[PDB]
Structures are given as C-alpha cells and as structure tokens.
C-alpha cells in the first residue's frame, strides 16, 4: 500500500535512517525516536494521510517498532 | 503522605521551533484551549519557549504519573497556567494527590520537574 510506504517514509525522516529493512527495531530503546518524535509522528500521519490518531489510542509499548506502527496505521485507514 | 512519582524533562527549544516552522499543528495537539489562548497572544520567541515548556512539563508529569503520555494520560488531561504573578500551577490533572511543577528556561533549553504525592 501507499500507506505503508508513507508510514515508513515518515519514520525515516524522523529517525534519520531507513527502517524498512529493520521493521522490528525498538525505535525508543535504540534512541532513534523519542517523545517528541512520537508526537511529530502523529502530526505527520494526520497531515500526510488524513489519519488522526488521538493520544488515547497511542501507547508507546504498542507503537515502538516500525512493523507495529504500520499495523496500527493500516487498520485505522 | 508519600511520593507517588517523579518526572523531569529537558527539551531543546530548536526542536520545538522546527516543528512550529514546518507549520504543523503542534499547539492544538499539546495545549488545552486555555493554554492555547495564552500561546496565541505571545510573539514568536516566547511562543517557542511557552510551547516547549508545556510539552516538557506534560512529559515530565506523565513520567511521575507512571505511564508516559498515552492512553493513561494525554496532553489534554494536563493543564498548566501561570498565576497573575507568573507562577505555574497544575490547574487540571488526573492524579488524586498533590502535584508539584517547576519550569525554567534559557534561550536554548527548557527544563521541568514534576513530583506527585499520595495521601
Ligand atoms: P522521550 O523521553 O522519549 O524523549 C527523549 C528526549 C531526547 C526528548 C529527552 O529530552 C528525554 O526526556 N530523555 C529521557 C530518556 C533517557 O534519558 N534515557 C536514559 C536512561 S535509559
């Protein structure tokens, strides 16, 4: 889907590296995504895809790998 | 009465400014209506620092609260408005106990600390 590619492109911009070949990296534990980035992630998803994710639906533990984030986004779409 | 949680946060103002300069709706996401009204009256340099400090304070609070920002506590569940003397108080928050907040900044950084107590 264009959605998965867009999610992975947003993540690449935020973390500074291509995570498409690294879909299970724990972004927060490795220090490539932090709090602030996770908010920017929500803003980008809404701006670029029209998918608003309310913070009540966001739990770091369930949004902490690229694969999980794509799954979360794919569904809402 | 005992400590329930603590949280501190150190935030780079230029990261906030970059998000704001990109035109993203960070203020609407992070700030309550009352906080947003205050933000709207400020010039840019002050808007960056205010925005950074609120982001910072609410991150710090969520760590004291135990969970980080998310389903247990979101940005819209915490409100922080300065007194008429300029003193910040946690006017709204989910925890049933005293909440302590302090904020300080330079031109480039903001630092916040929260302690929660349970009676
Ligand atoms: P968020 O806590 O994921 O953002 C991290 C941060 C760069 C914005 C920073 O200001 C912060 O709060 N870092 C806390 C993480 C840390 O210091 N870990 C070392 C102990 S594992």
Residue numbers in the entry:
A (entry chain H): 4 to 80
B (entry chain A): 1 to 119
Task: Share the article's original sentences.
TA d-alanylation is performed by the Dlt pathway, which starts in the cytoplasm and continues extracellularly after d-Ala transportation through the membrane. The first step in the d-alanylation mechanism of TA is the transfer of the phosphopantetheinyl moiety of coenzyme A (Ppant) to the DltC protein by the Phosphopantetheinyl transferase AcpS. The d-alanine-d-alanyl carrier protein ligase (DltA) catalyzes a two-step reaction: the activation of d-Ala using ATP to form a d-alanyl-AMP intermediate and then the transfer of d-Ala as a thiol ester to the Ppant group of DltC. Altogether, we conclude that DltC1 acts as an interaction hub for all the successive cytoplasmic steps of the TA d-alanylation pathway.
High quality diffracting crystals were obtained and the crystal structure was solved at 1.88 Å resolution. We first confirmed the trimeric assembly of the AcpS-DltC1 complex and brought new evidence that two AcpS monomers are required to dock one DltC1 molecule during the catalytic reaction. The interface between two adjacent AcpS monomers serves as a docking area for DltC1 binding. The first one is the largest and locates at the interface between the helix α2 and the loop connecting helices α2 and α3 of DltC1 and the helix α1 of one adjacent AcpS monomer. One is strictly conserved in B. subtilis and is established between the well conserved Arg15 of AcpS and Asp37 of DltC1, the latter being located just before the reactive Serine. The Asp32 of DltC1 located in the long loop between helices α1 and α2 forms a strong ionic interaction with Arg46 of AcpS and an H-bond with Tyr42. A clear electron density, corresponding to a phosphate moiety of Ppant, was observed covalently linked to the Ser38 side chain in only one of the 3 subunits of DltC1 of the complex. Indeed, although covalently linked to Ser38, it points toward a neighboring AcpS molecule and ends in the vicinity of the end of β2 and the beginning of α4. In this position, the thiol group at the extremity of the Ppant is stabilized via H-bond interactions with Glu49, Asp82 and the well conserved Arg46 of AcpS. Our finding that the AcpS/DltC1 cannot form a complex when DltC1 is fully Ppanted provides the molecular basis for the dissociation of the AcpS-DltC1 complex allowing subsequent DltC1 binding to DltA.
